[model samples]
Target: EHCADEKNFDCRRSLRNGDCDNDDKLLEMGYYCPVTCGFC
Candidate 1:
């Protein structure tokens, strides 16, 4: 799996902001940082 992360922002930092838990934000994270958000 070539699980790569987006370069626009910090994927790890997004978790601190709770993007993985928010439904709306999750969609964005799912596409850009699936690996970082543990969706992989």
Candidate 2:
């Protein structure tokens, strides 16, 4: 499996914004930053 971030997106900001907390928010964050957000 390839753990890659989205081409135009960054995880640091999303991480700071707490996108990894809730399941609903993770649905979006995980779409782009799955590796960084630990979804992989």
Candidate 3:
């Protein structure tokens, strides 16, 4: 997966909104979300 550019995986929305956490779970599920939304 690509790393975030704007926040470098430190985005507040991704963290606060649980996007980051969701991504982590997705990874374990063998699903990967593109970093287009600025997530790492």
Candidate 4:
């Protein structure tokens, strides 16, 4: 539930979902773009 982009990296719905339960998880997924979540 996020934009999953560089500048967008916006994580809104992630707060409720488990995909983005943690911000660091994004880095582990190779989302150096700042942050990410398939919810794009």
Candidate 5:
């Protein structure tokens, strides 16, 4: 997922600073701010 707002953009934080498996997938899907807060 992505975040339109920089403040809300914390992929690392949300993933507990862990490796996010689908960074490319989320970007490709056009997921933006208020992005999926939780895992699918």
Candidate 6:
């Protein structure tokens, strides 16, 4: 859920209703830290 919140924050701040641009921010989390993304 932490990743969801952080990703949401990124979307809200950077994307913010962009629709198309939101996907990039979501994908970015995969190539970074602090998201805790491993085995679901």
Give lDDT tens digits, candidate 5, residues 1-40. 3344235566546445433445764443234323443423
Predicted candidate 2 versus true structure: per-residue lDDT over 1-40, tens digit per residue: 5767787887888888887776798778767888888768
For each candidate in the order shown, give its overall lDDT on alpha carbons: 0.83, 0.80, 0.44, 0.46, 0.42, 0.40
**TM values, all candidates:** 0.72, 0.69, 0.31, 0.22, 0.23, 0.23
Q: Clash number for every model?
A: 0, 0, 0, 0, 1, 0
Ranking by lDDT: 1, 2, 4, 3, 5, 6
> After TM-score superposition, what is the CA distance of residue 28 in candidate 1 from its true location, in Å?
0.2
Candidate 5: misplaced stretches above 4 Å? 1-8, 17-40
Off by over 4 Å in 6: 1-23, 38-40
lDDT of 1 by residue, 1-40 (tens): 5666799878878888888789998878878898888878
**Best by the TM-score measure:** 1
For model 3, how big is the CA root-mean-square deviation?
A: 7.4
| Model 1 lowest lDDT segment of ten | 1-10
Tens digit of per-residue lDDT, candidate 6, span 10-30: 534433455324455446544
Over 1-40, each residue of candidate 4 has an lDDT whose tens digit, in order, gives 4434554443444434544556667554445232444543
Pitting candidate 2 against candidate 4, the one with the higher lDDT is 2
What is the Å distance of residue 15 in model 4 from its true position? 2.1
Residue 3 lDDT in candidate 2 = 68
Per-residue CA lDDT of candidate 3, range 1-39, in tens? 444334344445544666646745545322233353443
Residue 9, model 3, lDDT:
47
lDDT of candidate 3 vs native? 0.44
- What local lDDT does model 2 show for residue 8? 80
